[PDB]
Amino acid sequence: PRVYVDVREERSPVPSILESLGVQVIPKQLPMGDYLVSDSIIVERKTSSDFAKSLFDGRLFEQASRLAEHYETVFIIVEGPPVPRRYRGRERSLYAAMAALQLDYGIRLMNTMDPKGTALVIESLARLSTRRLSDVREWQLYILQSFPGIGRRTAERILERFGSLERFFTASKAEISKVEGIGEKRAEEIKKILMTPYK
Amino acid sequence: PRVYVDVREERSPVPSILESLGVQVIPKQLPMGDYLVSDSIIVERKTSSDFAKSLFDGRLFEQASRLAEHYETVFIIVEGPPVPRRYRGRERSLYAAMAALQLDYGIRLMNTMDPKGTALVIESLARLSTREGGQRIVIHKKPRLSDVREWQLYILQSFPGIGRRTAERILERFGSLERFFTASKAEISKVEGIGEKRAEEIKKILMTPYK
Amino acid sequence: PRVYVDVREERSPVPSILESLGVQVIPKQLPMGDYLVSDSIIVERKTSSDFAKSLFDGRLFEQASRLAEHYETVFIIVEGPPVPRRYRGRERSLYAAMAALQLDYGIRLMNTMDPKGTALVIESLARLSTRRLSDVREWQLYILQSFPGIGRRTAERILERFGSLERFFTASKAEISKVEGIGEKRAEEIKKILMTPYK
Amino acid sequence: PRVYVDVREERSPVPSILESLGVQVIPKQLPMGDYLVSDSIIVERKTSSDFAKSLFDGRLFEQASRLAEHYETVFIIVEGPPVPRRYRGRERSLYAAMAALQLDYGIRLMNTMDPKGTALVIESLARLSTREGGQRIVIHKKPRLSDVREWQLYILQSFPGIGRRTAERILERFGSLERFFTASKAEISKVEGIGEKRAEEIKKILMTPYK
Numbered sequence: 029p030r031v032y033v034d035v036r037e038e039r040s041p042v043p044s045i046l047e048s049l050g051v052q053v054i055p056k057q058l059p060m061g062d063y064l065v066s067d068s069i070i071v072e073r074k075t076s077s078d079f080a081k082s083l084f085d086g087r088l089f090e091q092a093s094r095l096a097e098h099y100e101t102v103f104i105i106v107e108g109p110p111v112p113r114r115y116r117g118r119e120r121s122l123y124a125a126m127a128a129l130q131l132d133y134g135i136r137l138m139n140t141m142d143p144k145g146t147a148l149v150i151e152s153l154a155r156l157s158t159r160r161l162s163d164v165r166e167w168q169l170y171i172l173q174s175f176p177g178i179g180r181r182t183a184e185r186i187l188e189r190f191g192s193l194e195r196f197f198t199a200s201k202a203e204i205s206k207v208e209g210i211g212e213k214r215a216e217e218i219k220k221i222l223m224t225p226y227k
Numbered sequence: 228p229r230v231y232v233d234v235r236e237e238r239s240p241v242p243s244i245l246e247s248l249g250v251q252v253i254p255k256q257l258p259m260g261d262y263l264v265s266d267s268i269i270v271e272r273k274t275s276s277d278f279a280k281s282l283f284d285g286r287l288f289e290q291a292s293r294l295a296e297h298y299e300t301v302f303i304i305v306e307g308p309p310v311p312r313r314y315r316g317r318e319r320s321l322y323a324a325m326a327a328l329q330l331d332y333g334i335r336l337m338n339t340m341d342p343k344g345t346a347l348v349i350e351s352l353a354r355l356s357t358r359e360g361g362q363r364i365v366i367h368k369k370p371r372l373s374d375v376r377e378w379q380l381y382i383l384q385s386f387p388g389i390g391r392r393t394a395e396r397i398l399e400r401f402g403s404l405e406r407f408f409t410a411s412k413a414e415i416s417k418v419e420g421i422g423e424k425r426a427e428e429i430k431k432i433l434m435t436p437y438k
Numbered sequence: 439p440r441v442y443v444d445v446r447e448e449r450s451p452v453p454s455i456l457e458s459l460g461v462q463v464i465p466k467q468l469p470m471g472d473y474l475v476s477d478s479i480i481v482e483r484k485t486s487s488d489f490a491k492s493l494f495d496g497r498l499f500e501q502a503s504r505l506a507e508h509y510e511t512v513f514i515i516v517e518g519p520p521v522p523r524r525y526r527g528r529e530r531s532l533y534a535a536m537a538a539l540q541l542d543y544g545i546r547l548m549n550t551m552d553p554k555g556t557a558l559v560i561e562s563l564a565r566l567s568t569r570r571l572s573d574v575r576e577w578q579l580y581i582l583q584s585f586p587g588i589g590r591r592t593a594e595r596i597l598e599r600f601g602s603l604e605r606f607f608t609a610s611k612a613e614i615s616k617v618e619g620i621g622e623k624r625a626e627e628i629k630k631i632l633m634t635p636y637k
Numbered sequence: 638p639r640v641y642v643d644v645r646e647e648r649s650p651v652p653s654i655l656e657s658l659g660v661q662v663i664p665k666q667l668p669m670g671d672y673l674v675s676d677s678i679i680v681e682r683k684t685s686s687d688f689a690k691s692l693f694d695g696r697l698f699e700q701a702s703r704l705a706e707h708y709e710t711v712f713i714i715v716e717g718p719p720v721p722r723r724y725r726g727r728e729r730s731l732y733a734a735m736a737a738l739q740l741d742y743g744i745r746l747m748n749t750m751d752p753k754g755t756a757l758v759i760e761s762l763a764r765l766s767t768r769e770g771g772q773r774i775v776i777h778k779k780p781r782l783s784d785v786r787e788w789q790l791y792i793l794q795s796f797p798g799i800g801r802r803t804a805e806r807i808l809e810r811f812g813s814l815e816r817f818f819t820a821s822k823a824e825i826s827k828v829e830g831i832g833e834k835r836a837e838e839i840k841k842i843l844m845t846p847y848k
Binding site for chain 3: 666676677709710712718719720728729732733735736737739740741745746747748749750751754757758760761762766767779782785786788789791792795796797808809812813814815820841842843844845846847848
């Protein structure tokens with residue numbers, strides 16, 4: 029397991045703990061990030077302090093996007109407490125940032141408790157590497173709104189009383205017409221469209 | 228912004244601090260996780276003690292893959308310090324697992340400090356996923372078409388895959404829209420145009436219940 | 439000019455006034471309507487009384503749809519005053535019906551003042567026969583919402599400040615970012631997507 | 638429910654009785670008709686006296702066809718009795734015209750009794766055209782795509798006609814999305830996939846102003 033270290037990183041305790049772990053550490057530089065586990069996996073290392081200062085600095089997302097732009101797998105390692113003593117306050121700000129990075133950048137947070145913690149995670153990434161049905165609601169509301177007289181509300185309102193598309197398609201003018209937003213008028217047109225044979 | 232919580236969870240502080248934060252919490256019987264943020268985002272809450280216990284049984288990776296083969300986003304929010312004093316000297320396994328969880332299964336891992344942190348994350352995920360601009364909204368004006376048969380065709384073409392031609396062919400084959408809407412995955416895909424794939428998708432649409 | 443008359447019609451004064459006009463009248467059926475001008479054009483004749491009584495009877499739309507179902511061109515002739523003396527009251531009801539028939543059934547109302555009036559219109563139909571850029575707004579709102587961070591409101595909000603799709607596409611990060619709903623963040627991503635060269 | 642009224646019309650009772658009836662009347666300079674009910678429905682109001690005058694000049698069919706080649710629904714609301722005493726003995730021409738108007742040009746003709754009738758019709762047309770169920774509404778969930786180039790493609794494919802292949806080909810040809818968005822109807826349709834038709838549609842999208 030090789031990992032590359034950017035030079036401005038060479039000096040933490042982490043390369044030492046990494047080597048001590050059987051992981052070869054190579055000084056490179058690196059156009060981005062802190063350790064390059066691979067070719068797809070880059071790791072930014074941050075003390076929760078540095079995370080914090082850098083959030084309220086644009087610096088966190090500046091880095092973030094850029095990191096996401098070039099590597100398939102961006103890991104931000106947060107070393108020490110998710111929320112340092114000094115920043116408990118703008119706490120919803122930090123957790124928030126953590127969610128957005130995770131979803132919008134697909135960046136991956138790990139919190140380690142110290143340098144060993146961080147070396148540990150990087151050594152692991154190292155070894156590990158070198159080793160919407162909910163789309164259905166819409167098509168239903170889509171299809172239902174395809175019927176004359178039916179909009180989106182009436183459509184959800186149909187899946188309300190009926191739940192299946194099938195049971196509504198199997199329904200009586202008798203049961204259909206009552207659904208608010210479908211008259212008898214409309215209802216008759218529907219049961220009819222639904223039942224007239226092809227030319 | 229609403230999230231569904233599991234019952235087991237109506238035990239916790241979290242749900243309530245969720246309501247504190249402008250989030251409508253609705254208890255549900257969830258086939259998985261503790262918190263469901265959207266169609267696509269599930270959250271499994273675990274204090275760190277339990278995270279570790281759950282690892283050391285085997286029960287951990289089993290529940291992770293389950294989640295991960297059902298939701299396209301899976302967060303495991305780990306509550307408390309990643310390594311409990313209770314588990315000093317087992318970091319290598321604690322960490323390697325956290326690692327294997329993201330790398331092999333994708334599973335995301337927010338680690339938060341208390342149940343407040345926990346709420347605050349879910350809160351953010353609630354809010355984030357419900358922002359306009361994560362969604363494309365179209366309004367089609369509808370034909371004032373005249374013939375039944377034309378509506379009949381129009382209608383059919385709104386099913387996924389079906390164009391106008393298969394439309395005709397469906398009705399050539401089944402006669403009623405009624406009888407097609409009733410037809411089996413065999414009888415349905417036997418129609419040139421609708422392949423076996425498109426048959427499954429259609430019945431799914433046809434017979435899946437609502438919310 | 440032949441027109442067909444349904445038998446239950448033969449007896450109005452209209453076939454007489456029609457013949458007197460050079461228009462041949464032939465007793466038939468008729469499965470529908472009152473006069474068949476053609477093969478595509480059918481005419482339902484109604485005294486505004488009969489129109490009125492038949493509106494608050496379902497009878498008007500029962501007839502209506504059925505009429506629309508079978509002929510390409512349905513004319514309802516309303517003879518005498520659009521709103522009889524007796525019905526001034528449910529007046530919004532009559533005009534309403536008149537709009538709905540006209541749009542939903544594409545049925546065509548003509549009001550004549552009497553039988554001559556009606557014969558006159560039918561004789562005319564007789565001779566006459568035998569002789570959405572607004573779709574653009576959407577594609578714009580469609581396309582705009584195709585950009586990361588942009589929903590429908592932000593999109594209309596873009597055509598608000600910008601009006602052209604082109605001028606916004608030509609815009610400065612400087613002008614872009616301010617549009618409410620687009621940060622600098624998002625803005626930078628946009629000007630960037632808009633300006634990065636192809637692989 | 639809002640309709641735009643022409644200025645000439647801010648003369649009439651109608652607009653006001655429109656506001657009486659729950660309709661937001663907005664005065665505009667309209668390139669045609671007196672009342673604009675939707676994208677697609679224009680209304681030309683004419684008392685019957687003027688209907689006839691306007692016939693007997695020649696000015697009638699000229700304005701009808703204009704309307705009819707710009708709106709897919711055209712109503713001429715005729716206010717007052719179809720034949721003014723003023724025009725007895727010219728029914729044949731009055732009627733034949735009403736006839737020729739619907740049959741040759743499509744133009745629909747509500748005849749109403751006073752300016753109240755007139756309002757009441759517009760009111761109904763206002764309401765009718767704004768009813769849910771005249772519209773199909775879709776909500777697409779948006780890719781959390783990763784690469785610029787992919788957004789770049791996604792984006793392109795949202796233009797009418799353009800699939801993924803032409804997408805590539807556009808960017809092969811123009812380099813920037815920026816420069817393509819700037820390109821002329823010639824330079825645009827010179828792209829295999831976008832024909833001369835699809836070029837017009839695109840610029841139209843690209844350069845038509847708003848509302």
